[PDB]
Design an enzyme around this catalytic site. Structure first.
Site, mmCIF file in Angstrom:
data_model
loop_
_atom_site.group_PDB
_atom_site.id
_atom_site.type_symbol
_atom_site.label_atom_id
_atom_site.label_comp_id
_atom_site.label_asym_id
_atom_site.label_seq_id
_atom_site.Cartn_x
_atom_site.Cartn_y
_atom_site.Cartn_z
ATOM 1 N N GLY A 49 4.944 -0.390 6.336
ATOM 2 C CA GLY A 49 5.955 -1.024 5.508
ATOM 3 C C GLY A 49 7.207 -1.343 6.304
ATOM 4 O O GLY A 49 8.077 -2.105 5.852
ATOM 5 N N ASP B 252 -0.731 -7.233 1.926
ATOM 6 C CA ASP B 252 -0.005 -5.965 1.954
ATOM 7 C C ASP B 252 1.486 -6.248 2.025
ATOM 8 O O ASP B 252 2.085 -6.232 3.103
ATOM 9 C CB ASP B 252 -0.427 -5.126 3.163
ATOM 10 C CG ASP B 252 -0.008 -3.668 3.035
ATOM 11 O OD1 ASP B 252 0.586 -3.303 1.992
ATOM 12 O OD2 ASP B 252 -0.273 -2.887 3.977
ATOM 13 N N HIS C 37 0.806 -1.213 0.000
ATOM 14 C CA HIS C 37 0.000 0.000 0.000
ATOM 15 C C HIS C 37 0.841 1.267 0.000
ATOM 16 O O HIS C 37 0.363 2.331 -0.394
ATOM 17 C CB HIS C 37 -0.996 0.002 1.168
ATOM 18 C CG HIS C 37 -0.434 0.478 2.470
ATOM 19 N ND1 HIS C 37 0.021 -0.385 3.446
ATOM 20 C CD2 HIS C 37 -0.353 1.720 3.003
ATOM 21 C CE1 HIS C 37 0.346 0.304 4.525
ATOM 22 N NE2 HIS C 37 0.128 1.584 4.283
#
Ligand SMILES: N=C(N)c1cccc(C[C@@H](NC(=O)N[C@]23C[C@H]4C[C@H](C[C@H](C4)C2)C3)C(=O)NCCc2ccccc2)c1
Ligand SMILES: [Ca+2]
Ligand SMILES: [Ca+2]
Lengths: 51, 234
Positions: free
Chosen positions: B186, B88, B42
């Protein structure tokens, strides 16, 4: 076995034909005792740096 | 990182920071090897053109240890769903290899079964990033880390307003004001084992930050180990 203190392995622990079998991540070599993982370079993965 | 701790010298070597054209950090990443970076899929929608900085602990000024690397290839999981944030995960291939040194080193990739029975079974994990120190505040200028307890899988589903897929896991606290936040996305979620840190999660999302009755949601790295392997071969 591997259920017991990780089979006394430093890192990965497997049970081949029953009985503990230890392995290490890339950048380490298995020690002669077949349990310890010996870093191969100055910056092995997973080790905080104290350079 | 809300209410964590500042990463002291050499403590969070595997941390990577994705920076936009304005050299501003907007997401984190985990160093997997001299050529590969792990991050959230994302995050690729958070910026058009971006680079990866490693070795930085304080963005206010260059100390001399940080280094910027351009991204050669971006490998996004084709099943990533903008809707739920399922799958993700992304891997980045850099144009030039990272030079390991003080504050710059990769985290270890574990094997699946072992990680699930020995790492995820641990009491806690460590998350880090340059994200917000508070839900509404601005992104942290200093790199922070936070020890977050693993959260019972079913105990998590109950607290969530959104569905927790098997590609997700939860860590954090129910009320205590500590959690990852916007900007840490992340980033690394690593689990320590005998003084060796293994990558176990990727900061994915959460309903707000450090909210009472809410936990931080992380993408389950163990569910993508083969995928990661294949990605690091191409
Ligand atoms: N608490 C954490 N550990 C954590 C970690 C990383 C990011 C986040 C928040 C971040 N998370 C999400 O968006 N989650 C989703 C889940 C699902 C699918 C998408 C749309 C909806 C429903 C919200 C994304 C967010 O809610 N908003 C973006 C901007 C913002 C930042 C700070 C405060 C409010 C709003 C929180
Ligand atoms: Ca700096
Ligand atoms: Ca909470």
């Amino acid at each position: 076995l591997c259920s017991l203190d990780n089979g006394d392995c430093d890192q990965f622990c497997h049970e081949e034909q029953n009985s503990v079998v230890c392995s290490c991540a890339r950048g380490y070599t298995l020690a002669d005792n077949g349990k310890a993982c010996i870093p191969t370079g100055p910056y092995p993965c997973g080790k905080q740096t104290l350079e | 990182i809300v209410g964590g701790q500042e990463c002291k010298d050499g403590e969070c070597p595997w941390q990577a920071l994705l920076i936009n054209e304005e050299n501003e950090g907007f997401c984190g990443g985990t160093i997997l090897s001299e050529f590969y970076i792990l991050t959230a899929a994302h995050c690729l929608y958070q910026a058009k053109r971006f680079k990866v900085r490693v070795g930085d602990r304080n963005t206010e000024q260059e100390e001399g240890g940080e280094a910027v690397h351009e991204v050669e290839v971006v490998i996004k999981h084709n099943r990533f769903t903008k809707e739920t944030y399922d799958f993700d995960i992304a891997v980045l291939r850099l144009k030039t290899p990272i030079t390991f040194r003080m504050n710059v080193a990769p985290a270890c990739l574990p094997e699946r079964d072992w990680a699930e029975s020995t790492l995820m079974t641990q009491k806690t994990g460590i998350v880090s990033g340059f994200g917000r120190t508070h839900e509404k505040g601005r992104q942290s200028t200093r790199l922070k880390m936070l020890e977050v307890p693993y959260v019972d899988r079913n105990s998590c589903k109950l607290s969530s307003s959104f569905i927790i897929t098997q590609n997700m896991f939860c860590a954090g606290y129910d009320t205590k004001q500590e959690d990852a936040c916007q900007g840490d996305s992340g980033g690394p979620h690593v689990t320590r084992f005998k003084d060796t840190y293994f990558v176990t999660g990727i900061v994915s999302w959460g309903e707000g930050c450090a909210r009472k009755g809410k936990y931080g949601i992380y993408t389950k790295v163990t569910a993508f180990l083969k995928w990661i392997d294949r990605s690091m071969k191409t």
